Amino acid sequence: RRCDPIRISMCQNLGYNVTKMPNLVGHELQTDAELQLTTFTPLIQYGCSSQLQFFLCSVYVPMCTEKINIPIGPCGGMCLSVKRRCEPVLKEFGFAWPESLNCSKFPPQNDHNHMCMEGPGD
Amino acid sequence: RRCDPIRISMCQNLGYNVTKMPNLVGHELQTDAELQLTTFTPLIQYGCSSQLQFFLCSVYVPMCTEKINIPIGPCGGMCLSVKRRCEPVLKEFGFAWPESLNCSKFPPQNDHNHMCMEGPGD
Amino acid sequence: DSDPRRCMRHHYVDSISHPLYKCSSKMVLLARCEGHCSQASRSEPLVSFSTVLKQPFRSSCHCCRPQTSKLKALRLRCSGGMRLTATYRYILSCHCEECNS
Amino acid sequence: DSDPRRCMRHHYVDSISHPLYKCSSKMVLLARCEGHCSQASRSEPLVSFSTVLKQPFRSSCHCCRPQTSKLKALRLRCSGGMRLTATYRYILSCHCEECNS
Ligand SMILES: *[C@@H]1O[C@H](CO)[C@@H](O)[C@H](O)[C@H]1NC(C)=O
Ligand SMILES: *[C@@H]1O[C@H](CO)[C@@H](O)[C@H](O)[C@H]1NC(C)=O
Ligand SMILES: [Cl-]
Ligand SMILES: [Cl-]
């Protein structure tokens, strides 16, 4: 009775099946999260980072599990990884890496002390 | 006004677009030719020879062209080629290479003296 | 059923004649290649630090072409006892190969 | 048309590194042409004579290629002093072009 299903299409079938609002960015409705996610569609299309779509979803519709009171988002390392490949593309369009995805506000790595989803180092 | 279109489905899109009855085997209707062709479907399925389907069609629905009074069928060399790969499979089923496809009743090779369709030597 | 779009050998008869001299035309059976290769074609930019650029793009494109063919020769009887040799190729198989390779 | 398999422009990114100096790898948004041309490729035999020198075949084949492009520069960030500059063609449009023009 703790987790809701994922109603945002572009964030389905990525490795987890349910989430919980509010997300890591403040939205109280998945519908608001979906809307803002759309602003990233071009970047995703460009093949900037194979992890981009997953990273964004993990922030906008974080993994929820019935077994603990907090949501599970990305680790700081995935953020940096995506950022280093993706930020430069944003700058080419006159945009900044958003403050809402500041990599330093994510746990630095997945351990018992703090659950976060890592991705491949390469 | 000399050639008819090919109404046998398994003999369409093989390199020529029209034919003329009677064929090289005696049938006066494509419908009869189609019926007898069906007896070869398993052999074709087995991958006995990549040329089999074309060779049979060239006999049962020979190439017709408005530019000359005779039909164009296979050369003897294609027959032998197919036969050598296909006859043994027929024998495994207790059947013979039919007398109607006796390779020696086809011109031995494509020249001005006699038009026949050759195929790859390998 | 066979895809009419694949690269395949088509058959046709045509006349061999000298485009100028006056001769005894001869009927002959020929084959030609035609169709669509399955591989998409593409072209990518190459990045250069060196002087200028060299060949700006790197590309791949597949064309339906004869794979094997028989070399044929025949003789026409032209005006006067004179005989003329014509050469052409009877295509046996077509395949898809790179445009510039 | 609107066929997604048509010859058109696609956008992609790539990481660029200078092989001769130690520099920060650089992301760059690039464009390529890719797709299937609507024209079937084909090839027929030609006939040679003593006085008619011809190639074995007459062929046609359409490839998806850059129609218009534009030089574009890439300033690298290197050993603390220097900036190296790569260049390449940024493709603006694509078209289907005869293989051997
Ligand atoms: C967020 O990132 C900006 C620049 O990366 C930096 O000023 C700030 O320190 C980061 N936020 C926190 C809380 O550290
Ligand atoms: C047909 O083939 C059989 C066996 O191959 C042979 O007896 C006969 O000679 C062939 N037909 C003709 C007319 O040669
Ligand atoms: Cl990547
Ligand atoms: Cl075979």
Residue numbers in the entry:
A (entry chain C), B (entry chain C): 43 to 164
C (entry chain A), D (entry chain B): 33 to 133
Recite the paper's sentences.
We purified Norrin–Fz4CRD complex and determined the crystal structures of methylated Norrin–Fz4CRD (dimethylated surface-exposed lysine residues) and Norrin–Fz4CRD–SOS (complex bound with heparin mimic sucrose octasulfate, SOS) at 2.3 Å and 3.0 Å resolution, respectively. These two complex structures show different stoichiometries: a 2:1 complex for the methylated Norrin–Fz4CRD and a 2:2:2 stoichiometry for the Norrin–Fz4CRD–SOS complex, the architecture of which resembles a butterfly. To investigate the preference for complex formation in a 2:1 or 2:2 stoichiometry, we performed SEC-MALS and SAXS measurements in the absence of SOS. Both methods show Norrin interacts with Fz4CRD in a 2:2 stoichiometry. Lysine methylation of the Norrin–Fz4CRD complex was used to facilitate crystal lattice formation, and on close inspection of the structure we found Lys102 and Lys104, two residues which contribute to the Norrin–Fz4CRD interface, (see next section) are dimethylated in the uncomplexed subunit of the Norrin dimer, and contribute instead to a lattice contact. This observation suggests that the 2:1 stoichiometry merely reflects the favourable crystallization characteristics of a sub population of asymmetrically methylated Norrin–Fz4CRD complexes. The Norrin–Fz4CRD binding interface is conserved between the complex structures. Each Fz4CRD interacts one-to-one with a separate Norrin chain, burying on average 1680 Å2 of surface area.
Unlike Wnts which have promiscuous interactions with Fz receptors, Norrin specifically binds to Fz4CRD, but not to the 14 other CRDs of Fz and secreted Frizzled-related protein (sFRP) family members.
